């Protein structure tokens, strides 16, 4: 019979197979259901399809096509809920989100 | 000498949501390490869920309960609404 990749049937972009192995190898539980990978690739594929579209819309505003960490650091700290998910993470080459306390500004 | 990664996938998604933009290496190896972080929190969460309830195995539900704890706020109501939409399509297509 003809081979249809399991990532196709789910319609996902991330690979469901490669996850379905990683759940076994990482020793997360003694058995892994067939529903977990398909469900776990979607969530990943959703999030990774979130930071990017945000990063992209940050790239266009700096008049650069390509995404670079400085764009990512801007896409994550601006958003309020992504920042809360990655609260502890420190992005390499990331730079900081521009912020000056109002008391310091001259007058 | 192969170190498998998500460099193909993240790049494929990027064309779906920005058919023009392309991503640079040092920015990819972030995403390639962001996923490997989330996928190690979610799974690492639905490993304690199954253990607590004494269920031996890890199934999808145990992932919903794993997502609705980590992903904060509006993501939780969008991820699980994006997860089920996948798994429902899968079983019905098998």
């Amino acid at each position: 019979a003809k081979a249809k990749t399991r990532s196709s049937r789910a319609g996902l972009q991330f690979p469901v197979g490669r996850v379905h192995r990683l759940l076994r190898k990482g020793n997360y539980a003694e058995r892994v259901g067939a529903g977990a990978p398909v469900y776990l690739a979607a969530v990943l594929e959703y999030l990774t399809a979130e930071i990017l579209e945000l990063a992209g819309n940050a790239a266009r505003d700096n008049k650069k096509t390509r995404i670079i960490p400085r764009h990512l650091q801007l896409a994550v700290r601006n958003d309020e809920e992504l920042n809360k998910l990655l609260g502890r993470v420190t992005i390499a080459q990331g730079g900081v989100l521009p912020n000056i306390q109002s008391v310091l500004l001259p007058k | 000498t192969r170190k498998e990664s998500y460099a193909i996938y993240v790049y494929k998604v990027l064309k779906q949501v920005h058919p023009d933009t392309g991503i640079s290496s040092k920015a990819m190896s972030i995403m390639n390490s962001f996923v490997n972080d989330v996928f190690e929190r979610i799974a690492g969460e639905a490993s304690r869920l199954a253990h607590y309830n004494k269920r031996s195995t890890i199934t999808s539900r145990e992932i919903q309960t794993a997502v609705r704890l980590l992903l904060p706020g509006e993501l939780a109501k969008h991820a699980v609404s994006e997860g089920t939409k996948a798994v429902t399509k899968y079983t019905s297509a098998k």
Binding site: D61, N78 | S81
Partner: peptide, 14 residues
């Protein structure tokens, strides 16, 4: 102002 994201749209569009 020379470097800006301007935060076009924040709330999720699924």
């Amino acid at each position: 102002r020379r470097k800006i994201i301007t935060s076009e749209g924040i709330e999720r569009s699924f």
